[PDB]
Amino acid sequence: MKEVIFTENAPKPIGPYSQAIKAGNFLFIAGQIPIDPKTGEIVKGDIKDQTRQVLENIKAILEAAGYSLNDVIKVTVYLKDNEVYAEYFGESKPARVAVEVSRLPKDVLIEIEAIAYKE
Template identity: 35%
Template sequence: MKSLAIAALLVAALPAAANAQVVNRIGNTPQARILTGAIVAPGAEIFHLSGQLASPIDPSKPATTVEAFGDTKTQTISIFNKIKTILAAQGYTMSDIFKMTVFVTAAPGMDGKMDFAGFNAGYGEFFGAAENPNKVARSTVQVAGLAGPNFLIEIEVTAARAKK
């Protein structure tokens, strides 16, 4: 009976162990918040998630204003929570993300520059953190505008896992 329980535990651990080998994450030297790159194993299932925008945080404000959605950090956290939900619905987790492209507009009060520190603060709550120690290969670019004047950031991700 004891060996049956041990065998069941080993079988339960197999998907996690297999998933750990799906993406070879190539770190930066010196250490950085992002990877140099990532190599996805042949046969992995890959999920390309379209760019996501923040959800409103203050419904009392007009939906066309930044105030309705928050600053760059707030919008970043909102987007990652949305991505987390979308991934979960498909059986993925945030730790399955290996590639990210981030589009950021000029933030109010930043003299026409993006709030990169605000984005990185939100990013740090989801990647290279206790809940998800993984980092991703990432590109971050400043753009002239997004789908509306209320949006400061849009994030698209690609995730991979072992085929089921």
């Protein structure tokens, strides 16, 4: 089965894409950036405040999709050229990919895309 996920607790995609799609038992979450869902405005803070907003958004999507943090299996982290993660990926310990790039959408510091599983 296939379902497009959408909750008001994570940034609202403005372009042609969804927050997350549940395909079978896998959940593919779109690249997340630091945007406060309630206000729709990008946080202009330090890497830790931005990274926390991102992880908060991902969690919102996981929850709306009916998953929990320990269902997360793979995380790709893109940074603009961290105990924060442990409270989120501690009981999960997903496989990780991390790279630095030129720029992210809306000149943000960090972007994260995730995949989760649930039997």
